[PDB]
């Protein structure tokens, strides 16, 4: 059985805290050391800062140590030790290390064994790293070791180059042996024996931690409570209350992160980061259910909660059809999408069990249709739909058009100087539209009525994503590899949230939906329409029907 329903990828090593009944692992994709209970209830990033390529993990949960070890083979390779709660982080070994691939612990002797796949040695050192000895060095037996094991006085290591597990003595490496001869990829090795795990008293057995209890080297309790991502620890230190602050949902290729809106916090853990996606372009969130909707190839929409749970395929191309960009109506429970193949704007019903999708606006040959929509945004309260179209050579011009959320009364708000028009976002509070023009390298602003068009930000290379929250405009530039925040009024005070982030994409602030303005035609008249309800300006709801059916 699989421990985690979500796809936690690039788990280079796994360490089991048998005393605390917790699981520790290192995520190479996120470059973080994450810890969770053995079942998987609460996964939390334990160490994130100053960590590039964490490979190799080790635990000493015995009551007197409660220590953690890991090895990094990236910039400035080293082996670090920290208490199993994440505190007291020190670099025990940082010299004569190039590629510290392997790492193990000899619990009785208090010696940790590690290997280098480049310098080709097998040394061990005390917990503080003061005393260091070499077992195997300057030997062709060790060519590309990966993992290590220590049963009694025998050390077993797997070499990926020689494709053979080998055994020798753990003090001088004399009794060399070949346990296995041909393994396609030996990689990790573990010695399954009760002696390998010394039993000890578990302080967490009687802890009052609400979500997670982790052993700590610091006394007197020798344990501490930990909060899952998006949660804040109460001063009582035993109960964790859920945080409610908004955060930037920064979408990149192959990963989606949650970045706290405060520029001071440089930790990408405002939520459980989605991993394993392919060509992520845009994202939408269901605040009420704490869901995150994103689209990945081929034209398929997936959803997961903010805590990395229930990650499924909400709607497939087989039933719903292809979709590229999203815009979620949180009032009427309708998900508006842009179809890349058909070059049209559609709507999908989240409410209920059966998924109904219909095409609202299609390329009808006039200048008021959809030529090649890139960004779409919705205003459920006012029943207006705003989208950005790059246009086509057939006659449809690059435009920022508007329409009612039933697909009627289309009009061209803005046009001209919209070369390489990117996604467009809507500020509901001020009824203004923010869009990014890559060709001009600017972020313009205009009213929802096609008036007061102004250039908010100048001198951009390839702006991709735009999000407006409170009085700040958050945008991302792919070529600059930067996420920047400016005042939405004038775009003057520029603050770099993140930098040197490759393959940036669109983003949206995970703000709390305004509960006051949480009613429209469909919300007030639920179940009136048989299949699809669409709000229209003035509080009137227009019933529509899915593909293949017609309204009676």
């Amino acid at each position: 059985r699989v421990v985690f329903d979500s796809s936690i990828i690039l788990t280079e090593t796994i360490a089991i805290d048998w005393v605390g009944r917790n699981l520790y692992w290192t995520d190479y994709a996120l470059e973080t050391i994450e810890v969770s209970k053995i079942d998987g209830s609460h996964r939390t990033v334990l160490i994130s800062k100053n960590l590039t390529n964490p490979r190799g993990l080790a635990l000493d949960p015995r009551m007197n140590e409660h220590l953690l070890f890991w090895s990094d083979w990236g910039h400035h390779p080293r082996i670090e030790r920290a208490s199993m709660d994440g505190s007291m982080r020190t670099v025990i070994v940082q010299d004569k290390i190039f590629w510290p691939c392997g790492l193990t612990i000899d619990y009785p002797n208090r010696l940790l064994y590690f290997m280098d796949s480049y310098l080709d040695y097998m040394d061990f050192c005390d917990y503080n790293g003061h005393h260091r000895r070499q077992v195997i060095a300057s030997d062709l037996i060790i060519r590309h070791p990966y993992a290590l094991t220590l049963f009694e006085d025998s050390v077993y290591w797997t070499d990926r180059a020689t494709r053979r597990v080998m055994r020798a003595n753990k003090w001088h490496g004399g009794n060399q042996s070949v346990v296995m001869y041909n393994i396609q990829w030996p990689l990790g090795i573990v010695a399954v024996h009760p002696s390998k795990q010394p039993n000890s008293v578990n302080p967490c057995a009687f802890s009052r931690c609400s979500h997670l209890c982790l052993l700590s080297s610091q006394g007197p309790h020798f344990y501490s409570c930990v909060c899952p991502s998006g949660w804040s620890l109460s001063p009582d230190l035993l109960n964790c209350l859920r945080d409610d602050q908004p955060f930037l949902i920064t979408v990149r290729q192959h990963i989606i992160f949650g970045i706290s809106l405060n520029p001071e916090v440089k930790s990408n853990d405002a939520m459980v980061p989605i991993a394993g996606i392919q060509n992520g372009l845009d994202v939408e969130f269901d605040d009420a259910e704490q869901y995150i909707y994103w689209v990945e190839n081929p034209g398929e929409i997936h959803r997961v909660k903010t805590d990395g749970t229930n990650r499924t395929v909400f709607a497939s191309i087989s039933m719903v059809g292809p979709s590229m960009n999203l815009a979620l109506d949180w009032i009427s429970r309708n998900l508006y999408s842009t179809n890349p193949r058909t070059q049209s704007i559609e709507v999908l019903t989240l409410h209920g069990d059966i998924r109904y999708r219909k095409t609202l606006i299609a390329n009808d040959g006039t200048a008021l249709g959809v030529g090649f929509p890139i960004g779409i945004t919705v205003d459920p309260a006012r029943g207006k739909l705003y989208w950005s179209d790059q246009g086509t050579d057939s006659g449809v011009p690059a435009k920022i058009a508007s329409a009612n959320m039933d697909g009627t009364s289309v009009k061209t708000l803005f046009t001209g100087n919209l070369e390489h028009l990117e996604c467009v976002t809507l500020d509901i509070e001020e009824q203004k539209l923010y869009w990014a023009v890559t060709g001009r390298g600017v972020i313009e602003r205009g009213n929802v009525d096609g008036t007061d068009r102004m250039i908010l930000v100048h001198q951009l290379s390839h702006p991709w994503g735009i999000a407006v929250h409170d009085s700040f405009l958050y945008y991302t530039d792919e070529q600059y590899e930067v996420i920047e925040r400016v005042d939405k009024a004038t775009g003057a005070n520029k603050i770099v949230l993140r930098d040197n982030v490759p393959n940036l994409r669109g983003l949206q602030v995970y703000h709390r939906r305004n509960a006051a303005e949480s009613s429209n035609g469909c919300s007030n008249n639920m179940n009136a329409c048989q299949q699809i309800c669409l709000p229209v300006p003035g509080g009137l709801f227009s019933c529509a029907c899915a593909t293949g059916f017609k309204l009676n």
Binding site: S138, D139, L140, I141, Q176
Partner: protein, 158 residues
């Protein structure tokens, strides 16, 4: 290199063709002789190991256990030098045990076939019995053990 590979030893005249070592040998290569210590060193590409033995062959110690197609071999000082066909480089190890297995050269472009030592200094000098009137030989002379050993042309029957 025939089946049941043998380290066949004889005199310079080939008086006593006695195989020194015949077991545990597939493709012997890079025979070397520890002149200072009177020992026999060799490598085997199929076995991928470097072993030493007495001149008679009573003793047999595997100096180097891990190797990749070790083909050449030579010995000098307290170090033993060999070449690998796979990594295409020259290594070095302590002749007594092999502790200091390091690489003497980078990844050579081609495969190093044979490695030898140039003893510019005094080599294994030994008075030649063949010096005195061809060592009492009307024909070719071969200075074997305990005096010279005369040799004859192979083309003719002698």
């Amino acid at each position: 290199w025939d089946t049941h590979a043998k380290i066949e030893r004889a005199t310079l005249g080939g008086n006593f063709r006695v195989p020194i070592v015949n077991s545990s040998l597939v493709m012997p290569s890079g025979l070397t002789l520890d002149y200072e210590e009177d020992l026999l060193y060799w490598v085997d590409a199929s076995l991928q190991r470097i072993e030493r033995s007495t001149l008679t062959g009573v003793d047999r110690e595997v100096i180097v256990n891990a190797a990749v197609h070790a083909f050449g071999l030579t010995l000098y000082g307290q170090y033993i030098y060999w070449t690998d066909l796979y990594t295409q480089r020259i290594y070095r190890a302590n002749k007594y045990d092999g502790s200091g297995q390091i690489a003497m050269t980078t990844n050579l472009l081609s495969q190093p076939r044979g490695i030898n030592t140039v003893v510019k200094n005094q080599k294994q000098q030994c008075n030649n019995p063949c010096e005195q009137f061809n060592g009492g030989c009307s024909h070719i002379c071969a200075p074997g053990p305990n005096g010279a050993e005369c040799q004859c042309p192979h083309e003719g029957n002698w």
